[PDB]
Structure 1
Amino acid sequence: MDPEFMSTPLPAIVPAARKATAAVIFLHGLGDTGHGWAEAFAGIRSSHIKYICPHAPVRPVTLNMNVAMPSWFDIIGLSPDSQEDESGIKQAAENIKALIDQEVKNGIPSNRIILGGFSQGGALSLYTALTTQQKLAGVTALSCWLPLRASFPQGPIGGANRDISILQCHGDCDPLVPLMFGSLTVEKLKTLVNPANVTFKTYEGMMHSSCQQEMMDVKQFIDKLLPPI
Structure 2
Amino acid sequence: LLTDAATVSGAERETAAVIFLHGLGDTGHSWADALSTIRLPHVKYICPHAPRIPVTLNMKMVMPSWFDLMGLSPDAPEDEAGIKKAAENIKALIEHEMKNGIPANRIVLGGFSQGGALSLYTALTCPHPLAGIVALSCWLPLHRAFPQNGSAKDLAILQCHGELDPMVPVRFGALTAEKLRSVVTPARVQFKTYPGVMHSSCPQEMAAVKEFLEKLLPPV
TM-score higher than 0.5: yes
State the distance in 1 between where 2:45 and 2:110 align. 11
Residue type of the partner of 1:160? A
Give, in whole Å, the separation in 2 of the partners of 1:87 and 1:158.
17
Match of 1:119 among 113, 123, 130: 113
197, 201, 204: which is aligned to 1:210?
201
Deviation for aligned residue 1:158: 6.5
Q: For the aligned residues, what is the CA RMSD?
A: 1.2
- If the length of structure 2 is used for normalisation, what is the TM-score? 0.97
1:226 alignment partner AA: L
Work out whether 1:174 is the aligned partner of 2:168.
no
The Cα of 1:193 is off from its aligned counterpart by 1.0
Of 84, 88, 100, the match for 1:106: 100
**Structure 2 counterpart of 1:15, from 9, 20, 32:** 9
The DSSP-based 3-state class of the residue aligned with 2:144 is helix
Specify the SS of the correspondent of 1:180. helix
Q: What one-letter code is carried by the residue in structure 2 that aligns with 1:17? A: A
- Preserved CA contact (<8 Å) 2:110 2:134: yes
Contact kept? 2:126, 2:150, Cα under 8 Å: no
Q: Which aligned pairs between 1:138-177 and structure 2 lie closer than 5 A? A: 138-153=132-147, 155=148, 157=149, 159-161=151-153, 163-177=154-168
- Of residues 52, 60, 75, the one that matches 2:54 is 60
Matches within 5 A, 1:70-89: 70-89=64-83
1:30 alignment partner, SS class: coil
Identity %: 67
Contact persistence 1:172–1:203 (CA under 8 A): yes
Cα distance change on mapping 1:220 and 1:58 into 2, 3 Å: same
Q: Which runs of 5+ in 2 are unaligned?
A: none
Contact in 2 for aligned 1:158/1:193 (Cα 8 Å):
no
Pairing 1:32–2:26 present: yes
Distance 1:197 1:64, change over 3 A: same
Give the whole-Å Cα distance in 1 for the aligned partners of 2:60 and 2:25.
13
Stretches of structure 1 lacking an aligned partner (at least 5 in a row): none
Query: Partner of 2:130 in structure 1?
Result: 136
**How does the TM-score come out when normalised to structure 1?**
0.93
For the residues of structure 2 that align with 1:111 and 1:10, how far apart are their CA atoms?
Answer: 23
Aligned residues between the structures? 220
Distance 1:79 1:187 in 2: 16
Deviation at 1:64, TM superposition (A): 2.1
Residue 150 of structure 1 aligns to a residue in which SS?
coil
